[PDB]
Ligand binder design. Sequence first.
Ligand code: 91D
Ligand code: GDP
Ligand code: MG
Length: 169
Amino acid sequence: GMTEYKLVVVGACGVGKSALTIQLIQNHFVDEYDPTIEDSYRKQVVIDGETCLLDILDTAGQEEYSAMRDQYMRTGEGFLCVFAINNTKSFEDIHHYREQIKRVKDSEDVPMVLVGNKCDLPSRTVDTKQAQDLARSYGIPFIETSAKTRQGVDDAFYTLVREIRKHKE
Ligand SMILES: *CCC(=O)N1CCN(c2nc(NCCC(=O)N(C)C)nc3cc(-c4ccccc4F)c(Cl)cc23)CC1
Ligand SMILES: Nc1nc2c(ncn2[C@@H]2O[C@H](COP(=O)(O)OP(=O)(O)O)[C@@H](O)[C@H]2O)c(=O)[nH]1
Ligand SMILES: [Mg+2]
């Protein structure tokens, strides 16, 4: 049957995990999505000529037990690690998310993509070079996005699918 890619979107509160996912799935920018809602979304896309299904968990890191979070963490194939380019703390927190991903997968070789979001905003506090150097240290792609304008949104998710394809082969 049709190939499915199970993706998990993670990162600190307010970096735009929900806005990015909703821009990807529904092709519009949600100004204030409830910060405590976790939910999953499915969309049929074509990536490099291949029709496939994206199965995406937009995490909200609530301490209540979430069976959806449980199933996606263990069976998820790739992770988008999101920070906002005007949120220095959320860039600094990438190390924690990368560590947690390695731990939940019990694997040093997990498909991931570093995403720097909100690039429509002026006077960023996290330089492109900063994040390019970090992703290079991790050996992962870095993509700059704007969930508001849609810049780089498809690129971020499709690049993560390509990282997963490389891992599987
Ligand atoms: C603000 C609402 C929101 O979008 N989220 C809630 C908080 N959340 C989250 N927070 C943490 N905190 C750890 C603090 C830290 O950096 N220390 C060094 C102590 N940790 C999370 C971990 C995960 C996670 C668990 C397992 C595997 C992969 C993971 F990313 C998640 Cl999903 C969320 C948080 C972010 C979301
Ligand atoms: N200007 C701008 N605002 C954004 C962008 N992405 C998200 N936001 C806003 O940032 C705030 C937090 O976004 P949200 O998607 O709820 O973040 P989450 O906590 O990671 O799920 C919301 O007010 C969004 O409208 C963006 O790319 N550009
Ligand atoms: Mg959210």
